[PDB]
């Protein structure tokens, strides 16, 4: 009921599609950042939202700034998210699988690098 994801210096996630077993009651995303670049230069976060809510989350996120992990505080559109991390760091996030609906389209992405994205499916 977990998945390990890496966001590197070349602005790439090592997965573009996540599968969550609806049998799981909790899902865990373990984000790590291989490379040398610091959080202020190559910071990555892992954010989950519906495909439709993605742009809103990304724009309002960038405006919130680095100190707010490029995420709008208490954003109800963010189903789950990790903290912004720099190279060498690591951060995990666990969420209730019931926050997800079967058949709906979810996108996971990094707000400061929204092209680093993928799908999340139950």
Tell me the closest approach of the beta carbon of residue 113 to Cu ion, in angstroms. 3
Q: How far is CA 44 from CA 49, 56, 105, in A?
A: 16, 18, 22
* Cβ neighbours around 103 below 10 Å, total: 6
Using CB under 5 A as the binding rule, whether residue 39 contacts Cu ion is answered as no
Query: In this structure, are residues 60 and 115 in contact, taking their beta carbons and an 8 Å threshold?
Result: no
Q: Return the structure tokens found at 89.
A: 């760091």
Nearest approach in angstroms of CB 112 to Cu ion is 5
Interaction of residue 5 with Cu ion, rule CB under 5 A: no
User: Applying CB under 5 A, which part among 14-22, 24-32, 40-48, 81-89 lies near Cu ion?
Assistant: 40-48
Of 13, 29, 31, 44, which one interacts with Cu ion (CB under 5 A)? 44
């Amino acid at each position: 009921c977990s998945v390990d994801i890496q966001g590197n210096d070349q602005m790439q996630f090592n997965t573009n599609a996540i599968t969550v077993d609806k049998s799981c009651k909790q899902f865990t995303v373990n984000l790590s950042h291989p490379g040398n670049l610091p959080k202020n230069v190559m910071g990555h976060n892992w954010v989950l939202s519906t495909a439709a809510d993605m742009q809103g989350v990304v724009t309002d996120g960038m405006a919130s700034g680095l100190d707010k992990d490029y995420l709008k505080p208490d954003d109800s559109r963010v189903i789950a998210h990790t903290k912004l991390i720099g190279s060498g760091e690591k951060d995990s996030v666990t969420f209730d699988v019931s926050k997800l609906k079967e058949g709906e389209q979810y996108m996971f992405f990094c707000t400061p690098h929204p092209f680093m994205k993928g799908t999340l499916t139950l």
